[PDB]
Amino acid sequence: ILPDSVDWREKGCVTEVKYQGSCGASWAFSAVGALEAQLKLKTGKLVSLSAQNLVDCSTEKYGNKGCNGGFMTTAFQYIIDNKGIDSDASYPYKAMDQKCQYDSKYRAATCSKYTELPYGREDVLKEAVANKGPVSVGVDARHPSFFLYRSGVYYEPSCTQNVNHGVLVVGYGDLNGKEYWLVKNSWGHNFGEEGYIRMARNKGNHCGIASFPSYPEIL
Numbered sequence: 001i002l003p004d005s006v007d008w009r010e011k012g013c014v015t016e017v018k019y020q021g022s023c024g025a026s027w028a029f030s031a032v033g034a035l036e037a038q039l040k041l042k043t044g045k046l047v048s049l050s051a052q053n054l055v056d057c058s059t060e061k062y063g064n065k066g067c068n069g070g071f072m073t074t075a076f077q078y079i080i081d082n083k084g085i086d087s088d089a090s091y092p093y094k095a096m097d098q099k100c101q102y103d104s105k106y107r108a109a110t111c112s113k114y115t116e117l118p119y120g121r122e123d124v125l126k127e128a129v130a131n132k133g134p135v136s137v138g139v140d141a142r143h144p145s146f147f148l149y150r151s152g153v154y155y156e157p158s159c160t161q162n163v164n165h166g167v168l169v170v171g172y173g174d175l176n177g178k179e180y181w182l183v184k185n186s187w188g189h190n191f192g193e194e195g196y197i198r199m200a201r202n203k204g205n206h207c208g209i210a211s212f213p214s215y216p217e218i219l
């Protein structure tokens with residue numbers, strides 16, 4: 001039996017909203033966000049992890065292009081292969097492509113594995129969000145209605161299932177019966193509902209929210 005609503009922010013499992021600025025590193029913020037939650041679950045401590053570490057180091061071998069986009073899955077694989085990721089404090093976000101500056105001295109997390117969820121399965125996503133934690137997802141964000149969103153449950157008829165922007169599902173619920181996914185963005189505190197957007201849930205994989213979900217785990 002799954003809870004009707006979840007909000008991982010209420011459990012201390014979500015860090016402050018970040019601002020990617022003019023560097024297309026949403027994939028990096030989505031990956032660290034998911035891992036931050038697992039680190040909290042495991043160690044009891046909440047610390048922002050370095051999105052910049054991913055931008056600079058999870059590069060061509062991982063199919064990523066830093067400020068020109070990437071995948072959360074291969075970000076996790078990088079952390080796995082690298083045997084860690086630095087704290088955001090030690091390796092702060094500069095919103096540009098840099099030389100890899102990873103230093104094991106300032107490692108704040110590791111990752112053992114990651115799991116991908118099946119395409120379009122909102123039922124499976126719900127279950128992972130309830131039972132595992134926040135889940136990294138892609139959405140189709142190429143719609144003025146998306147970046148102009150201020151409040152409520154976002155539904156956009158022109159939205160497609162083909163994803164182009166990485167975000168973090170940190171919960172789910174309903175607003176007077178309109179089901180939603182509670183989504184953490186990386187466009188700062190001024191986007192939407194204090195950095196968050198509530199996006200239509202159980203409406204046919206709206207904006208591809210459930211197209212390519214993944215989440216990491218720490219042994």
Ligand SMILES: Cn1c(=O)n(C2CCN(CCCn3cncc(-c4ccc(Cl)c(CNC(=O)c5ccc(F)cc5)c4)c3=O)CC2)c2cc(Cl)ccc21
Nearest residue numbers: 027061062063064065068069070071138163164165166212
């Ligand atoms: C080592 N290695 C990989 O292992 N991959 C893939 C192989 C498996 N895919 C499938 C994962 C499922 N999936 C399939 N389609 C789209 C997204 C997806 C998810 C989230 C987001 Cl945010 C985006 C958007 N990303 C981009 O558009 C993008 C832009 C520039 C890039 F360089 C990379 C991605 C796509 C997604 O996860 C991901 C890594 C690789 C791909 C390349 Cl060209 C080179 C090396 C790779």
